[PDB]
Amino acid sequence: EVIIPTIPKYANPYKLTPGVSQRLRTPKALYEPWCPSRLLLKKRNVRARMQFLLDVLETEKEVEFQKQRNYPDFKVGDVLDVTMVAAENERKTYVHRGLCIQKRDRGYGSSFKLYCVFSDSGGFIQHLPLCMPDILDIKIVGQVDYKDEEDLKELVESESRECKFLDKVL
Amino acid sequence: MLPNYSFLKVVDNSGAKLVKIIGFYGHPGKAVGVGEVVKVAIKEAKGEKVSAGEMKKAVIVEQKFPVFRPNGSHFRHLRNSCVLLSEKGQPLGNKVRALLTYEFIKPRWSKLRTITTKKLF
Amino acid sequence: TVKRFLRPGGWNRLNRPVKERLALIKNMATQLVEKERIRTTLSKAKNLQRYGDKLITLGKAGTRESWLKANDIVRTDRELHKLFTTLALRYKDRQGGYVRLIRAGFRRGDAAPVAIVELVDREGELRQARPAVTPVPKFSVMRWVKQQLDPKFISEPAPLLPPLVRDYLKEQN
Amino acid sequence: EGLEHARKDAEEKGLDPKKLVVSTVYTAKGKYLRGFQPMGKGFAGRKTTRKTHLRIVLRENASVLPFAAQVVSPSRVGGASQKHLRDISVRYTV
Amino acid sequence: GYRPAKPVYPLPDSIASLVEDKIAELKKFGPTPEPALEPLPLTPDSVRVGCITVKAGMTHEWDEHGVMIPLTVLWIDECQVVGLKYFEKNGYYAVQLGAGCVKQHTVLPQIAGYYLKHDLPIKREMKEYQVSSPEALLPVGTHITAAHFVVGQQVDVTGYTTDKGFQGVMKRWGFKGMPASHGVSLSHRKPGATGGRQDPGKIWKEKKLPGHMGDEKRTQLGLELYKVDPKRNLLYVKGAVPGPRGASILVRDSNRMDYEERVALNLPYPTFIGSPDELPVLVRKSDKDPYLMYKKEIDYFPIKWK
RNA sequence: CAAUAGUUUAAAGAGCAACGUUAAUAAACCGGAAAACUUUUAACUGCACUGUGCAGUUGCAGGCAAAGCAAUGUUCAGCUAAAAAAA
Ligand SMILES: [K+]
Ligand SMILES: [K+]
Ligand SMILES: [K+]
Ligand SMILES: [Mg+2]
Ligand SMILES: [Mg+2]
Ligand SMILES: [Mg+2]
Ligand SMILES: [Mg+2]
Ligand SMILES: [Mg+2]
Ligand SMILES: [Mg+2]
Ligand SMILES: [Mg+2]
C-alpha cells in the first residue's frame, strides 16, 4: 500500500563538472543550463541560466566551424586574398584582393571589411561575416602602413595606391 | 536608398553628365536603389545626342547606401551613378565605365552586361 | 548590493555634473582611509563603498602602474603612504569585501536616509568580521570537493616570505 | 510630547497607564503672524505663519481599535553579534 | 472591482428543506474519468494541446543554401498535465497544463494545496487547453516535451511584451508632431487637436493619448519551426517572439494550416508516446531556390517597354 | 534586437533605436465583469527599488579572479547564525 518514488541516477560518478562546452581558459561550470530547475543543487535564476545557455550553443557551433576551416590571424592594415562563391552566378568561384579596414572579434558573429580601388570606377567596400560558408579561403599577401584611424579614414575617402588587382580572378 | 529629387552622375558616353530624379514608376516606396528605373531631367550635357532641359529614363547602377545580400554580407560604392535608357529599354550609349554587380545578372539586362567594362561577377 | 545604472561605469550621478562628481568622490575616499569610519547619506555611501573597494585593490597591487593611478585619486601624501604600506599588508588574504555599509535611519532636517561606512578588519570595528581565509574541517565533504576542483585552495594565512624565497636567501647566504 | 504629558497627568490622578486609550484628539486655531510678499507688476500677496493648539484626552477601558504592530530587533552591532561563527561546511553536502 | 453584495434572507420553513434537497442532488457527481494514453486517428476538426515554454534569446545560422536565418530559442523545462475538466461537472472538456517549479514557502496555501493533494510539484504557471472529445483527455502527470512537435511545421506564439514605461504620442502611436522651426512655440511633440467645438462637444472613447506602454498580451501567427532538439527540450523558431528574456510563451499548432497539411506532417495525436531521450536533432529541409530570380523573371518590375 | 546603421567616455559583445529583421488578409485577434469548478488554519510588507525581479538564504546584475564581463568561477560585504549525546 506504499509506493516508493523513483530517484534519478548521477550521470558522471564522482565527477563534479558536467563537462559543458566552454572556452579553454574559462573556469568550468558545475551545472547544465538546460537542466530542469527541480534537479539543481543551486536554484539560480532562469533569466541568468538562459544567458549561459546561449553561450554554450555559440561555442558548440564555433567548434564545428574550426574543424571545417582554418584561417590566419589577420589584423587591420593587412592585404588579403579572399576566395568566395557567388550564389547568384550559379555558385561560381572568384578571388578578391583588398585591404582590411575593420575587424570585429565577437565570437560566431565576427566580421571584417575589405576595401579596394579600381582604375576608373573608384572605391568599393564589402562587409563579410567571417563564419559564412560562402568564404572558402583567406591568405595574407602584404601590409599597408597607417598612423591612426583618422589617417586610415582619410586614405579610404581619397582613393589612391589601393589598386592591387584591377579586376577579380576566375 | 535615393529619395526623389536627388542628383546623379552619368557613367555612359551619351554626353550627359548630371541628371536629377523627378519621378518614380510603380510603387517602390519613399526611396529607390540599384536596379530600378526612374525619370530624370538633364541638367548638364555636352553633346548632340542629348541636351540640357530634356527628360529621359535611367537605371541606377551604383549607390553609397549598403546593398544587402541573402548571405548576410553587403557592399557600398563611393558615388551615385545611372545609365540613360531609351523608350524601348536600351542604353543610349555603347560604353559604360562602371562596376557591374549581381543585380544585372538578370536576363533583362543583357545589353548592359555586354557594353560594361568591369564586372564584379 | 550597489545598484548598476546605464551611464559609463554604472555609477551614481550624485545629482552633480561629472567633473564635480569626480572631485567629490576623491575627497571622501581620502577621508575614509584617514579615519576608517564615516557617516553620510545613503547615495554617497553606496558609491563610496564600491569606489573604496577598488582603491584598496590598487594598494594591494604594489606596482608602479597602480601607484600612478592612485596618486591621482588620493589627496594627501600621508593617506597615500598608509594605503600601500599598512592596508596592503592588512588585506593580503582577504578577497574582496574590504568595506561594509550599515543603514542608520533618517536625518532630522530633510529626513534623508543615512548610513555608516567602515573597514572590516581592525581595532574599533563595529562588528567582528569573518576570517580572511575560511578554515576547512579535516573530515568534511568541503575538503574533498575543494581538492577535486581547486587543488590550490588556501586554508590558513600565509607568511610574508614564502618558503621558496626563504630557501633562496639561505642558499645565497 | 503631548502623549507623554497626558500620561503623566493620568498617573497623578490614579489611573493605570496599561489600560489607557486615546479617546479624543482635536486641534484649535491660534494667533497668526500676518505678512506680505511682493509679486510681479506691482501686485502683492499674503505671507502668513500659522499656529495651532492640540488637545489629547486619555481614558481607561474606552472602545479601542484592534490594530497591532509587529516588532523586530534592530541591527546587532558589538560583542552581541555572532554571525561570524557560522559554519559554512554543511551547504556543500547533499 | 465587484458590485456591493446583495442582501440575503432566510428561507421559509415550508420551503427550506425542499431547496436543500434539490441543490444537493444537482451538486452530486459521479466518478472521475480515467483517460488512457493511446494513439488516436486525426479528424478534420480536432485540436491538439499546446505547451508552456521559456524564451531564451536570439541567434543565427546558415542553411543548406547558404542563407542567414535569424532564430529564437525556446526552452521547455517541465510541462505536465495537472488537471482535467469534463462535461458532467464543468460543461466542457479541457486539459490543464502547468510548468515551472517553486518552493513551498513562497506561494499562498491555496495554490500549494492543489498540487500537494495529488502528489505533484508546485508549478509556477498554469494554463488550460480545450479538447474536442472525452477521448482527447490525457492522464494527469503526462509530460509534454519537445517531441510533441514536428520539425518544419508552423506554430503560433503568445506572450506579454516588454515594458516601456510612460511614453508620448509620437513614440506610442506614431503621431507626426509639429515643425521644429518657423515660429512654433512649446508644442513640438504635443498631440494637437483632440476634438472640435460645441458639436459633438466631447472626446470619444479610446482617443489616442500618452500613457503606459509595453506590457500587453500579443500573438504571432505562422512562424516556422526550424530545428528541434528533443533531448534538451529546445525549439528553434525563425522570426521574432514577443517578450523579453525569461518571458513565458505559449506554443500552439498554427491555425493557418489546413487539414491536408496536418495530415502530411503526421503530427502526434494525442501526443508523442515514448522516450524523447533517444531522438536525434533534426533540421527542416526547404525545397525552394532563394536565387531563382537571377535565372527566371519572377520579380516585380512595373515598366512595360516599347 | 542574432546580424547591419546611428547614439553615451567614471564605456561597452551595455541599453534604447530604424535606415534593419519577422508575421498577418481572419467567424482571426484583444479588454473587463461573471455563472460553475477547485484549493485554503479563507488570503494580504520587503532584496537602495521613481527600469525590470519570469531572484527570498549555498537567494543575489556588490566586491574579488587567469573569465565571453547583467554570463562562468569564488573562502569576502549586507539583509537572516546553527547543532541533542551514543548505538
Ligand atoms: K578594481
Ligand atoms: K469610440
Ligand atoms: K524575438
Ligand atoms: Mg517694481
Ligand atoms: Mg519632425
Ligand atoms: Mg510667446
Ligand atoms: Mg521650440
Ligand atoms: Mg478651442
Ligand atoms: Mg533589448
Ligand atoms: Mg560586478
Side-chain angles (χ1 to χ4, degrees), chain E residues 35-52:
Chain E
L37 183 58
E38 188 68 9
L40 297 172
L42 192 65
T43 61
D45 187 358
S46 174
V47 179
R48 300 198 309 163
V49 303
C51 189
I52 306 171

PDB file of all heavy atoms in Angstrom, chain E residues 35-52:
ATOM      1  N   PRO E  35      -8.521   8.818 -18.134  1.00  0.00           N
ATOM      2  CA  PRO E  35      -8.032   8.812 -19.516  1.00  0.00           C
ATOM      3  C   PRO E  35      -6.985   7.735 -19.744  1.00  0.00           C
ATOM      4  O   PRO E  35      -6.241   7.353 -18.838  1.00  0.00           O
ATOM      5  CB  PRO E  35      -7.431  10.212 -19.688  1.00  0.00           C
ATOM      6  CG  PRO E  35      -8.033  11.034 -18.605  1.00  0.00           C
ATOM      7  CD  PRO E  35      -8.252  10.100 -17.464  1.00  0.00           C
ATOM      8  N   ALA E  36      -6.938   7.246 -20.980  1.00  0.00           N
ATOM      9  CA  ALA E  36      -5.959   6.258 -21.410  1.00  0.00           C
ATOM     10  C   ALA E  36      -5.085   6.862 -22.500  1.00  0.00           C
ATOM     11  O   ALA E  36      -5.582   7.551 -23.396  1.00  0.00           O
ATOM     12  CB  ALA E  36      -6.641   4.989 -21.927  1.00  0.00           C
ATOM     13  N   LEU E  37      -3.783   6.598 -22.419  1.00  0.00           N
ATOM     14  CA  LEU E  37      -2.815   7.154 -23.358  1.00  0.00           C
ATOM     15  C   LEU E  37      -2.607   6.157 -24.492  1.00  0.00           C
ATOM     16  O   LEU E  37      -1.970   5.116 -24.305  1.00  0.00           O
ATOM     17  CB  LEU E  37      -1.501   7.468 -22.647  1.00  0.00           C
ATOM     18  CG  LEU E  37      -0.412   8.125 -23.495  1.00  0.00           C
ATOM     19  CD1 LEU E  37      -0.907   9.427 -24.102  1.00  0.00           C
ATOM     20  CD2 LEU E  37       0.837   8.366 -22.660  1.00  0.00           C
ATOM     21  N   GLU E  38      -3.145   6.478 -25.672  1.00  0.00           N
ATOM     22  CA  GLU E  38      -3.070   5.588 -26.821  1.00  0.00           C
ATOM     23  C   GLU E  38      -3.177   6.425 -28.083  1.00  0.00           C
ATOM     24  O   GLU E  38      -3.912   7.422 -28.079  1.00  0.00           O
ATOM     25  CB  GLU E  38      -4.190   4.543 -26.779  1.00  0.00           C
ATOM     26  CG  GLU E  38      -4.076   3.455 -27.832  1.00  0.00           C
ATOM     27  CD  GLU E  38      -2.893   2.538 -27.595  1.00  0.00           C
ATOM     28  OE1 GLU E  38      -2.264   2.643 -26.521  1.00  0.00           O
ATOM     29  OE2 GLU E  38      -2.591   1.714 -28.484  1.00  0.00           O
ATOM     30  N   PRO E  39      -2.479   6.073 -29.163  1.00  0.00           N
ATOM     31  CA  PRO E  39      -2.612   6.850 -30.402  1.00  0.00           C
ATOM     32  C   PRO E  39      -4.047   6.846 -30.907  1.00  0.00           C
ATOM     33  O   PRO E  39      -4.762   5.849 -30.798  1.00  0.00           O
ATOM     34  CB  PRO E  39      -1.668   6.134 -31.374  1.00  0.00           C
ATOM     35  CG  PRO E  39      -0.690   5.431 -30.508  1.00  0.00           C
ATOM     36  CD  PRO E  39      -1.457   5.019 -29.291  1.00  0.00           C
ATOM     37  N   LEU E  40      -4.462   7.979 -31.469  1.00  0.00           N
ATOM     38  CA  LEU E  40      -5.809   8.153 -31.983  1.00  0.00           C
ATOM     39  C   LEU E  40      -5.762   8.694 -33.404  1.00  0.00           C
ATOM     40  O   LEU E  40      -4.825   9.411 -33.768  1.00  0.00           O
ATOM     41  CB  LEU E  40      -6.617   9.117 -31.104  1.00  0.00           C
ATOM     42  CG  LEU E  40      -6.860   8.690 -29.657  1.00  0.00           C
ATOM     43  CD1 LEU E  40      -7.500   9.825 -28.876  1.00  0.00           C
ATOM     44  CD2 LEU E  40      -7.727   7.443 -29.603  1.00  0.00           C
ATOM     45  N   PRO E  41      -6.758   8.369 -34.226  1.00  0.00           N
ATOM     46  CA  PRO E  41      -6.818   8.955 -35.568  1.00  0.00           C
ATOM     47  C   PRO E  41      -7.112  10.446 -35.514  1.00  0.00           C
ATOM     48  O   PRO E  41      -7.789  10.940 -34.610  1.00  0.00           O
ATOM     49  CB  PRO E  41      -7.957   8.185 -36.243  1.00  0.00           C
ATOM     50  CG  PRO E  41      -8.815   7.726 -35.121  1.00  0.00           C
ATOM     51  CD  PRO E  41      -7.884   7.453 -33.977  1.00  0.00           C
ATOM     52  N   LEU E  42      -6.593  11.164 -36.506  1.00  0.00           N
ATOM     53  CA  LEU E  42      -6.799  12.602 -36.613  1.00  0.00           C
ATOM     54  C   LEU E  42      -7.980  12.878 -37.534  1.00  0.00           C
ATOM     55  O   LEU E  42      -8.062  12.319 -38.632  1.00  0.00           O
ATOM     56  CB  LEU E  42      -5.536  13.284 -37.140  1.00  0.00           C
ATOM     57  CG  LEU E  42      -5.489  14.809 -37.045  1.00  0.00           C
ATOM     58  CD1 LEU E  42      -5.475  15.262 -35.594  1.00  0.00           C
ATOM     59  CD2 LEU E  42      -4.277  15.348 -37.785  1.00  0.00           C
ATOM     60  N   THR E  43      -8.888  13.738 -37.087  1.00  0.00           N
ATOM     61  CA  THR E  43     -10.112  14.048 -37.806  1.00  0.00           C
ATOM     62  C   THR E  43     -10.083  15.474 -38.342  1.00  0.00           C
ATOM     63  O   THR E  43      -9.253  16.289 -37.928  1.00  0.00           O
ATOM     64  CB  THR E  43     -11.334  13.868 -36.895  1.00  0.00           C
ATOM     65  OG1 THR E  43     -11.245  14.768 -35.784  1.00  0.00           O
ATOM     66  CG2 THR E  43     -11.413  12.438 -36.382  1.00  0.00           C
ATOM     67  N   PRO E  44     -10.980  15.812 -39.274  1.00  0.00           N
ATOM     68  CA  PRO E  44     -10.918  17.147 -39.892  1.00  0.00           C
ATOM     69  C   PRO E  44     -11.025  18.288 -38.899  1.00  0.00           C
ATOM     70  O   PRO E  44     -10.465  19.363 -39.147  1.00  0.00           O
ATOM     71  CB  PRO E  44     -12.105  17.134 -40.865  1.00  0.00           C
ATOM     72  CG  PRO E  44     -12.337  15.700 -41.161  1.00  0.00           C
ATOM     73  CD  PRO E  44     -12.015  14.969 -39.895  1.00  0.00           C
ATOM     74  N   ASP E  45     -11.727  18.096 -37.783  1.00  0.00           N
ATOM     75  CA  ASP E  45     -11.878  19.122 -36.750  1.00  0.00           C
ATOM     76  C   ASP E  45     -11.416  18.505 -35.435  1.00  0.00           C
ATOM     77  O   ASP E  45     -12.219  17.949 -34.682  1.00  0.00           O
ATOM     78  CB  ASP E  45     -13.315  19.622 -36.674  1.00  0.00           C
ATOM     79  CG  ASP E  45     -13.472  20.799 -35.733  1.00  0.00           C
ATOM     80  OD1 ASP E  45     -12.468  21.207 -35.111  1.00  0.00           O
ATOM     81  OD2 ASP E  45     -14.602  21.321 -35.615  1.00  0.00           O
ATOM     82  N   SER E  46     -10.118  18.609 -35.164  1.00  0.00           N
ATOM     83  CA  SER E  46      -9.529  18.037 -33.958  1.00  0.00           C
ATOM     84  C   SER E  46      -8.318  18.871 -33.579  1.00  0.00           C
ATOM     85  O   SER E  46      -7.346  18.933 -34.338  1.00  0.00           O
ATOM     86  CB  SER E  46      -9.129  16.578 -34.180  1.00  0.00           C
ATOM     87  OG  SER E  46      -8.439  16.065 -33.056  1.00  0.00           O
ATOM     88  N   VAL E  47      -8.379  19.504 -32.413  1.00  0.00           N
ATOM     89  CA  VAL E  47      -7.326  20.394 -31.939  1.00  0.00           C
ATOM     90  C   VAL E  47      -6.462  19.649 -30.935  1.00  0.00           C
ATOM     91  O   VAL E  47      -6.968  18.865 -30.121  1.00  0.00           O
ATOM     92  CB  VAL E  47      -7.920  21.672 -31.317  1.00  0.00           C
ATOM     93  CG1 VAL E  47      -6.815  22.584 -30.815  1.00  0.00           C
ATOM     94  CG2 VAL E  47      -8.797  22.398 -32.324  1.00  0.00           C
ATOM     95  N   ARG E  48      -5.156  19.889 -30.994  1.00  0.00           N
ATOM     96  CA  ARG E  48      -4.208  19.343 -30.036  1.00  0.00           C
ATOM     97  C   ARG E  48      -3.943  20.354 -28.928  1.00  0.00           C
ATOM     98  O   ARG E  48      -4.324  21.524 -29.009  1.00  0.00           O
ATOM     99  CB  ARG E  48      -2.890  18.969 -30.723  1.00  0.00           C
ATOM    100  CG  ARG E  48      -3.002  17.931 -31.821  1.00  0.00           C
ATOM    101  CD  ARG E  48      -1.639  17.323 -32.113  1.00  0.00           C
ATOM    102  NE  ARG E  48      -0.620  18.346 -32.340  1.00  0.00           N
ATOM    103  CZ  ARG E  48       0.691  18.126 -32.290  1.00  0.00           C
ATOM    104  NH1 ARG E  48       1.158  16.917 -32.012  1.00  0.00           N
ATOM    105  NH2 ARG E  48       1.539  19.119 -32.513  1.00  0.00           N
ATOM    106  N   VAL E  49      -3.274  19.886 -27.878  1.00  0.00           N
ATOM    107  CA  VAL E  49      -2.869  20.771 -26.795  1.00  0.00           C
ATOM    108  C   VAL E  49      -1.542  21.437 -27.143  1.00  0.00           C
ATOM    109  O   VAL E  49      -0.765  20.955 -27.970  1.00  0.00           O
ATOM    110  CB  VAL E  49      -2.780  20.007 -25.461  1.00  0.00           C
ATOM    111  CG1 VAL E  49      -4.110  19.350 -25.138  1.00  0.00           C
ATOM    112  CG2 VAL E  49      -1.662  18.974 -25.499  1.00  0.00           C
ATOM    113  N   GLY E  50      -1.285  22.567 -26.502  1.00  0.00           N
ATOM    114  CA  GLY E  50      -0.057  23.314 -26.685  1.00  0.00           C
ATOM    115  C   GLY E  50       0.985  22.969 -25.645  1.00  0.00           C
ATOM    116  O   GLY E  50       1.013  21.861 -25.102  1.00  0.00           O
ATOM    117  N   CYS E  51       1.860  23.932 -25.368  1.00  0.00           N
ATOM    118  CA  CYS E  51       2.895  23.760 -24.362  1.00  0.00           C
ATOM    119  C   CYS E  51       3.296  25.125 -23.825  1.00  0.00           C
ATOM    120  O   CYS E  51       3.083  26.154 -24.468  1.00  0.00           O
ATOM    121  CB  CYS E  51       4.113  23.025 -24.935  1.00  0.00           C
ATOM    122  SG  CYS E  51       5.332  22.534 -23.699  1.00  0.00           S
ATOM    123  N   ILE E  52       3.882  25.120 -22.628  1.00  0.00           N
ATOM    124  CA  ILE E  52       4.378  26.326 -21.974  1.00  0.00           C
ATOM    125  C   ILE E  52       5.899  26.274 -21.990  1.00  0.00           C
ATOM    126  O   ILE E  52       6.496  25.279 -21.565  1.00  0.00           O
ATOM    127  CB  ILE E  52       3.845  26.450 -20.535  1.00  0.00           C
ATOM    128  CG1 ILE E  52       2.317  26.356 -20.522  1.00  0.00           C
ATOM    129  CG2 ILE E  52       4.300  27.764 -19.914  1.00  0.00           C
ATOM    130  CD1 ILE E  52       1.717  26.250 -19.137  1.00  0.00           C
TER     131      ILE E  52
END
